[PDB]
C-alpha cells in the first residue's frame, strides 16, 4: 500500500525500455529536418527522454499521467506512419506490448494503495 512506490517502478521500467533496441526511434524527440512534415501531422510530440525527465523532475503526480505520455509516443507513431508495415511503427507495436505488460501492475498497485489510503 506504498503510494510512492510507482515512481521507482517507472524509473526501472524506463531503464528496461532504454535497453530495448525497439525504443531506438523513440528515445529523443523527432527531428524536424529528417521528418520535415512531422508537426503538420502530430500536434503533441513525445519521447522517452522527455518522459524520464518529467518523472525525474517530480512533474508526474501519478503513474496514470506517465502512462498517458508513453501512450502518446505510440499513438504519434501510428498517426505518422505511412504504412502499418513500417519498420519504426512495427518497433512501436512491440515496445507498446512490452510497456503495457509491465505498467499494468504499477497502475493496479498504485490505485489499490490510494484506495487503502482513503479507506
Ligand atoms: O527518427 C525518428 N525519431 C528521432 C529520434 C532521435 C533523433 F535524434 C532524431 C529523430 F528524428 N522517428 C521516430 C518515430 N517516427 C515514427 O513514429 C514513424 C512511423 C513511421 C515512420 O516514422 C517518426 C520519426
Swiss-Prot record:
Expressed in myeloma and epidermoid carcinoma cell lines. The modification Phosphoserine is found at residue 90. It is found in: Nucleus. Residues 1-106 form the Bromo domain. The modification Phosphothreonine is found at residue 44. Interacts with IRS1 and IRS2. Interacts (via bromo domain) with acetylated lysine residues on histone H1.4, histone H3 and H4 (in vitro). Probable regulator of the insulin and insulin-like growth factor signaling pathways. Stimulates cell proliferation through regulation of cyclin transcription and has an anti-apoptotic activity through AKT1 phosphorylation and activation. Plays a role in the regulation of cell morphology and cytoskeletal organization. It is linked to Chung-Jansen syndrome: An autosomal dominant disorder characterized by developmental delay, intellectual disability, autistic features, anxiety, hypotonia, obesity, and dysmorphic features. This is PH-interacting protein. It comes from Homo sapiens. The lineage of its organism: Eukaryota, Metazoa, Chordata, Craniata, Vertebrata.
